[PDB]
Amino acid sequence: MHTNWQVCSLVVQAKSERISDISTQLNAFPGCEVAVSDAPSGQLIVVVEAEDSETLIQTIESVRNVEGVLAVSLVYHQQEEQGEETPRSHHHHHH
């Protein structure tokens, strides 16, 4: 099915010299499109669209595993999971 997926822009700070290699490689990722490419600053805007939030993470983490990327600033970020000290209502019923 077509799930309610989310797109996320990535401000990729990378080696300004190596921008051509990095952009080419990143645009070859699944769901990743290089929208904006500013070679002078080393900024690559990559928009990633993925089905589930976790599928997005799987993809974005791979983006951050490229040599050339210095910092990936995710335009859409949440807090850490942290852990809930007192759980909420779960409705996992077998019956």
Coordinates of N, CA and C in Angstrom, one line a residue, residues 41-84:
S41 N 30.3 26.2 -0.7 CA 30.2 26.0 0.7 C 30.3 24.5 1.1
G42 N 30.0 23.6 0.1 CA 30.0 22.2 0.4 C 28.7 21.7 0.9
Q43 N 27.7 22.5 0.5 CA 26.3 22.1 1.0 C 25.6 21.4 -0.1
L44 N 25.1 20.3 0.3 CA 24.2 19.5 -0.6 C 22.9 19.3 0.1
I45 N 21.8 19.7 -0.6 CA 20.5 19.5 -0.1 C 20.0 18.2 -0.7
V46 N 19.7 17.2 0.1 CA 19.3 16.0 -0.4 C 17.9 15.7 0.2
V47 N 16.9 15.4 -0.6 CA 15.6 15.1 -0.1 C 15.4 13.6 -0.2
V48 N 15.1 13.1 0.9 CA 14.9 11.7 1.0 C 13.4 11.4 1.3
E49 N 12.8 10.5 0.5 CA 11.4 10.2 0.7 C 11.3 8.7 0.9
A50 N 10.8 8.3 2.1 CA 10.7 6.8 2.4 C 9.4 6.5 3.1
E51 N 8.9 5.3 2.8 CA 7.6 4.8 3.3 C 7.4 5.0 4.8
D52 N 8.3 4.4 5.6 CA 8.1 4.4 7.0 C 9.3 5.2 7.6
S53 N 9.1 5.8 8.8 CA 10.0 6.6 9.4 C 11.4 5.9 9.6
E54 N 11.3 4.6 9.9 CA 12.4 3.8 10.1 C 13.2 3.5 8.8
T55 N 12.4 3.3 7.7 CA 13.0 3.1 6.4 C 13.8 4.4 6.0
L56 N 13.3 5.5 6.4 CA 13.9 6.8 6.2 C 15.2 6.8 6.9
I57 N 15.2 6.4 8.2 CA 16.4 6.3 9.0 C 17.5 5.4 8.4
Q58 N 17.1 4.2 8.0 CA 18.0 3.3 7.3 C 18.7 3.9 6.1
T59 N 17.9 4.7 5.3 CA 18.4 5.4 4.2 C 19.4 6.5 4.6
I60 N 18.9 7.4 5.5 CA 19.7 8.6 5.9 C 21.0 8.2 6.6
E61 N 21.0 7.1 7.4 CA 22.2 6.6 8.1 C 23.2 6.2 7.0
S62 N 22.8 5.6 5.9 CA 23.7 5.2 4.9 C 24.3 6.5 4.2
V63 N 23.5 7.5 4.1 CA 23.9 8.8 3.5 C 25.1 9.4 4.4
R64 N 25.0 9.2 5.7 CA 25.9 9.7 6.7 C 27.2 8.8 6.7
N65 N 27.1 7.7 6.1 CA 28.2 6.7 6.0 C 29.2 6.9 4.8
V66 N 28.9 7.9 4.0 CA 29.8 8.2 2.9 C 30.9 9.0 3.3
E67 N 32.1 8.7 2.8 CA 33.2 9.5 2.9 C 33.1 10.7 2.0
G68 N 33.0 11.8 2.7 CA 33.0 13.0 2.0 C 32.1 13.9 2.8
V69 N 31.1 13.3 3.5 CA 30.2 14.0 4.3 C 30.8 14.3 5.6
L70 N 30.7 15.5 6.1 CA 31.2 15.9 7.3 C 30.1 15.9 8.3
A71 N 29.0 16.6 8.0 CA 27.9 16.6 8.9 C 26.6 16.6 8.1
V72 N 25.7 15.8 8.5 CA 24.4 15.8 7.9 C 23.4 16.4 8.9
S73 N 22.9 17.5 8.5 CA 21.9 18.2 9.3 C 20.6 17.9 8.8
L74 N 19.9 17.1 9.6 CA 18.6 16.6 9.2 C 17.5 17.7 9.5
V75 N 16.8 18.1 8.4 CA 15.8 19.2 8.5 C 14.6 18.8 9.4
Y76 N 14.5 17.5 9.5 CA 13.4 17.0 10.3 C 14.0 16.1 11.4
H77 N 14.0 16.6 12.5 CA 14.6 15.8 13.6 C 13.6 15.8 14.8
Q78 N 13.7 14.7 15.5 CA 12.9 14.5 16.7 C 13.9 14.5 17.9
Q79 N 13.4 14.3 19.1 CA 14.2 14.1 20.3 C 14.7 12.7 20.3
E80 N 15.5 12.4 21.3 CA 15.9 11.0 21.4 C 14.7 10.2 22.0
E81 N 14.7 9.0 21.8 CA 13.6 8.1 22.3 C 13.6 8.3 23.9
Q82 N 14.8 8.2 24.5 CA 15.0 8.4 25.9 C 14.5 7.2 26.7
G83 N 13.3 6.9 26.5 CA 12.7 5.8 27.3 C 11.6 6.4 28.1
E84 N 10.5 5.7 28.1 CA 9.4 6.2 28.9 C 9.4 5.5 30.2

